[PDB]
Design a protein around this nucleic acid. Sequence first.
RNA 1: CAUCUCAGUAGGAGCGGGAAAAGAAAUCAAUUGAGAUGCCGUAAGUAACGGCGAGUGAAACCGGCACAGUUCAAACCGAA
RNA 2: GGUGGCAAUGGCUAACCUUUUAUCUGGGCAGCCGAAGCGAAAGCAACAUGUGCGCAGCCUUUUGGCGAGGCACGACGUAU
RNA 3: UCCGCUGGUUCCUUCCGAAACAUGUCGCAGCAUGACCUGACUUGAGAUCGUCGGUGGAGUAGAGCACUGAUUGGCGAUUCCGGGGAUCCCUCGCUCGCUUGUCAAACUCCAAACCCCCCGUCAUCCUAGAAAGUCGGAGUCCGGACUGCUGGGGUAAGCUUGUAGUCCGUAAGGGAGACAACCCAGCCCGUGGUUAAGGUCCCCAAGUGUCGACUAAGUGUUAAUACUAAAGGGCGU
RNA 4: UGGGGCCCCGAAAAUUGACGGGGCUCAAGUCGACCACCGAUACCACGGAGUACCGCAAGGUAAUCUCGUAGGAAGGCGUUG
RNA 5: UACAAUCUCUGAAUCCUGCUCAGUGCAGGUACCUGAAACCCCGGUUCAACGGGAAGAAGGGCCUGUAAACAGCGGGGGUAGACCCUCUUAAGGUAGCGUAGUACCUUGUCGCUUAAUUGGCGACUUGCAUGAAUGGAUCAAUGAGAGCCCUACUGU
RNA 6: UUUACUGCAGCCUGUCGUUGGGUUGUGGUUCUGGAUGUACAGUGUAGGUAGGAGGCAUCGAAGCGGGUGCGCCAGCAUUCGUGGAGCCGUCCUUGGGACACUACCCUUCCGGGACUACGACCCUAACUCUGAGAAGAGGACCCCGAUAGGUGGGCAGUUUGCCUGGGGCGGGACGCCCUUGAAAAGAUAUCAAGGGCGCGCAAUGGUUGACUCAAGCGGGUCGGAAACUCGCUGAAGAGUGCAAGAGCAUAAGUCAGCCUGACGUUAUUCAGCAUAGCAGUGGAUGACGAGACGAAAGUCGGCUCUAGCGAACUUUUGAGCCUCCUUGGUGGGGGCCAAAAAUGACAGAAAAGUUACCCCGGGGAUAAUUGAGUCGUUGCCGGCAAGAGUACAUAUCGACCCG
RNA 7: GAGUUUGGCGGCCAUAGCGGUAGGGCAACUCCUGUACCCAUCCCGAACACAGCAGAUAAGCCUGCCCGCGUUCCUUACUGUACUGAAGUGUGCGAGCCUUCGGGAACUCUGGAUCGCUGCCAAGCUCA
Length: 92
Amino acid sequence: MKIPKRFRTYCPFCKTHNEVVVERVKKGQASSMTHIARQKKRQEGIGNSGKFSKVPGGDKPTKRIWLRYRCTVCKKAHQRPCFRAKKFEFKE
RNA sequence: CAUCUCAGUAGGAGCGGGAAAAGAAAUCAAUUGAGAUGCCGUAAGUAACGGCGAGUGAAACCGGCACAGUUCAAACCGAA
RNA sequence: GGUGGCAAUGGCUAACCUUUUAUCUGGGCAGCCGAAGCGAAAGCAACAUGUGCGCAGCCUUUUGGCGAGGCACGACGUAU
RNA sequence: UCCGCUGGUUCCUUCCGAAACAUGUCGCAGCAUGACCUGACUUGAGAUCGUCGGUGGAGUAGAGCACUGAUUGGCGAUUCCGGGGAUCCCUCGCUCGCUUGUCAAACUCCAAACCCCCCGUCAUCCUAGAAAGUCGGAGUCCGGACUGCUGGGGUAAGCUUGUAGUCCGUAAGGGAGACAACCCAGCCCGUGGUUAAGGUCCCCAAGUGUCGACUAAGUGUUAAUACUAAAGGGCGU
RNA sequence: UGGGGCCCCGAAAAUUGACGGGGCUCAAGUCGACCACCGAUACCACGGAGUACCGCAAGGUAAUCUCGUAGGAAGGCGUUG
RNA sequence: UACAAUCUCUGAAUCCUGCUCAGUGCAGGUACCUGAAACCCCGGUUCAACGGGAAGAAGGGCCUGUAAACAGCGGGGGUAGACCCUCUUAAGGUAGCGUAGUACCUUGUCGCUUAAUUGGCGACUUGCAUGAAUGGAUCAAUGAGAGCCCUACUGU
RNA sequence: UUUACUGCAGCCUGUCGUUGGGUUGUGGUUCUGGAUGUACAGUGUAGGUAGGAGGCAUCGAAGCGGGUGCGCCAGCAUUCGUGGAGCCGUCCUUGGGACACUACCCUUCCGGGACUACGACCCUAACUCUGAGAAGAGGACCCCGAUAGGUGGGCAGUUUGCCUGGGGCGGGACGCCCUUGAAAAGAUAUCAAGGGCGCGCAAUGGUUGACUCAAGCGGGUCGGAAACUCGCUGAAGAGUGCAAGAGCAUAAGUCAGCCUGACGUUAUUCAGCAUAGCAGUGGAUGACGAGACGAAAGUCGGCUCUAGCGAACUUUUGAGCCUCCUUGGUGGGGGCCAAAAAUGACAGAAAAGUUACCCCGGGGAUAAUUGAGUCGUUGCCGGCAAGAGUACAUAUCGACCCG
RNA sequence: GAGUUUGGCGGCCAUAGCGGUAGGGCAACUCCUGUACCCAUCCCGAACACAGCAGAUAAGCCUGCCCGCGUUCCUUACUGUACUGAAGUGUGCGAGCCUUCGGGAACUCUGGAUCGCUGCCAAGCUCA
Ligand SMILES: [Mg+2]
Ligand SMILES: [Mg+2]
Ligand SMILES: [Mg+2]
Ligand SMILES: [Mg+2]
Ligand SMILES: [Mg+2]
Ligand SMILES: [Mg+2]
Ligand SMILES: [Mg+2]
Ligand SMILES: [Mg+2]
Ligand SMILES: [Mg+2]
Ligand SMILES: [Mg+2]
Ligand SMILES: [Mg+2]
Ligand SMILES: [Mg+2]
Ligand SMILES: [Mg+2]
Ligand SMILES: [Mg+2]
Ligand SMILES: [Mg+2]
Ligand SMILES: [Mg+2]
Ligand SMILES: [Zn+2]
């Protein structure tokens, strides 16, 4: 499973066909100031705590490949529905 | 079913009267106003909370009943 | 749902007062629903009839005509 | 306290009258939504339970080997891919063609009778309101049986699981010895009359009826039916 | 020799006993036909009740209305105030 | 007040008590790795929230001891059933006992006990699935314990 | 009961308070004696840097010492002297820094004194134990209050599904796709039969052009009955990524050229889920905006058609906007639209056992076995007789098959 | 204005295909002659492209015929047979089957047919 580093595809902002650069979308780290974290602080007391003592869930046999297509003119990225592959070479 | 709900309920300890508790803004408002407290009506099953599930859940503005404001500490005198 | 009062100049009052003992008569516009919608929000803001088919009913040569309500369009407000 | 689990729930008549099924469910003794029942209202002209003819859909029964898999011998050769016992001395199965004998639920060159959509016609319903629409109230999701489908499974079963019609459930009255669902019949009350199913020696209403033969075993005197014995033999008749 | 109808052998179960029973032999059995009669709340006639729909009422139409469980709807009776 | 208290296993006497520290448990060591908050350092915030760094307690990893701690003591096929090999994921049953209160096959085979015994006792034993303080073997006296046999007695 | 899920006591340890006075090793905090500042040296020591230089000097300035701040035993300071001139640099040691007094505000130097935090030691007056008390023994440790991390069936609250020819065991007929069952429209069950899927591919994708594949027959060199080539027959007997079924010949197949439509946004209808409600999500027609190939017509919303997948809440990412309570700004939150992260019990609980010590409510809606149905099996017979019986099927025994 | 022949684009898609055989080219098609040019070969002017006079009906195309295989149709028998819709107090120990009214094959058999029908337009002609 390869895919070119660059190719020519419609840019939804420029509304024209021109080169794009493909890259990998890396999952960030959850911050501590969102309201879920504040709720987790407010709900920690004595004993059980509901959602925040849930065991972590399982996983699926193969995840999707999450990619971001960034234009080379306006530098504005856009995302597309992603396929599912095990080994993903990124064939420039 | 574990947070939640049942519910500050059932139950317990203390104190206490014909009533008790509260009570004279370090308040509520919004551009500018009101002027102690209690109780009833409404705001309203709204805002808000919540495995944002089941459920829980106000107040201010406004209309009434009844109306009431004051006393110490200190600065000055020093037993008056 | 069946039966009623009032009716866009809309409908109803709640607590309470007049109670002359719980009735009753007259007040009580706070407030709730209706009157403008769309949208998460900021915000913006529509036909007081333009056309056709046609039931009831009425007119008529008994065949056609007018045709409330009904149905189908057209036009417009807002969100995307 | 709570339960989807067990028992009970009090007067009369009148009009209409089901489902024991599909999907979701920590669902299988429960519930929701739909099908099916009932009441009211709006609208205002058609509807199709049935017949005949035509334009179309067939791929089941049956039939057959033209494809796919099997299958029986004879004949002629594969001068192979093959097993028997240095010119592979020569035997020769598998295989390819012509003829004979069988097959198929996942085969088809063929191909019905039922059945389905639509058009026309007849016929029935309909302004005393067709088709369609809106709102209120439910019950029900333990079913069973008979006649067909050589239904599927199973040695078979009053077994288990499907499907079309009609029934019991909720169906009186008449006849089957009695018989949930078998035959006649779908039922307001009273009187008279004629018939259906079935019967007519006595029990028991009506034939010791008619015509032509058979049986000698008390065989039989038993529509269907979960209730009725087979292969084989008989110079029995 | 072949094809048919009926019957016989093949054919043994436990309380006493099941063509419904008595019984039945040119039949009161089997096969093919036929005639007459009996026999329902079915069908016909008369009278009566109710219901559905229409009509101002009087009344009119009903071969095409009268079964019924779960259940829906309508009108009435009774007890105490 | 250690000839004590508390906590466990086994169960008089007699002959004895084998091998295994892989698993789990316990104790000690913590070289090294991991390991929260507070304090400290940097970035951030006209201040905070917040993000990294250093350091590093108990505990864990890692190492050592411990079986009268909880526990374990295996296959087959060569060879008069030996013994060289095995399968050895720590080791592969020592003394004893053995068809058992444990032996499925099973009413195992032989002897004593009866005319005749799925019985009792003795012997063998390839032990489905015996075994040493999960105590092994045997044992005089005792037993309202559980089996079998002899004698006397009797209406069982 | 436990190495089920979630917690709570008990115990072990860090930090804060109670909590004091000294010994010193720590590091800056904080403070002096010199700009200490100095390689291409120096007549000069970059008196940081620097008005790229002008005031000092027998009215104090030099070369030298162990060497005076310090460093290159050079030398700016005048210090203990020593000679009795280093002046600025427009002679810049023409500079890493090129240098002059009222500036050294600042490499630094660092009695590091100073409050602080750490590791160890000492003291008594807090505090603790003993005693009627004097007093004795410990001692800023321990106990105690708070907080953080561990161990923790000692104890508590719960979960441990369903289908099923009774339950269990086995399995998953618990989500999706094809053929038969299925009775020639549609629908149709069983732990019914045959099965498959939880993927792979920058080419194995799009378009245009040129062609025809499987297998045989005839010929050519050891190119052996195993190779490549020429001619003929060849509607498909091949290939089309993967199951089954269907489709395809001037092609939906094979090869070459050019490309990335494996595009952003949006509306209906169909099936999932006949008739007849039900997510998400897929597949067929379209619409707007951009393209590829081709003379054009046209084809292209991946790989010929039907499988290859998941709601709400939550976090993360992309474009642009809306918003936070009298007003304006900064940091930080909340919202709208799409994509990714998973619930396989697949229309979506954070989840193990035992009860013969058991308790309760129901069930013949569902089992031991009494009954009823069936007869595979079991007991008992029959038909044909193959053969044996010294000859002779039937004195006697009786095969195979059938009832 | 009717007909014939030739040429192009087609409808039904084997009654049209397979094989065999005898005839024709005047107008038309074809075969057929070469590679300057646009164009081409995974090599080849083979093909495609261009340029076109010669000769030929031996091939394509056209007309006539052949039952020799395959396909389509009719008739005789099989046969109102197999199968089947509706009703049945008809029948079998059983798996099953029978009567009435209504539908109705497949193969095989005797004998015949089928060697395509047809739409639009143009050109050469052939008439009044
Ligand atoms: Mg008192
Ligand atoms: Mg007060
Ligand atoms: Mg509360
Ligand atoms: Mg058949
Ligand atoms: Mg129910
Ligand atoms: Mg019936
Ligand atoms: Mg009925
Ligand atoms: Mg009856
Ligand atoms: Mg009722
Ligand atoms: Mg030992
Ligand atoms: Mg005995
Ligand atoms: Mg517990
Ligand atoms: Mg509870
Ligand atoms: Mg179960
Ligand atoms: Mg016990
Ligand atoms: Mg009980
Ligand atoms: Zn762009």
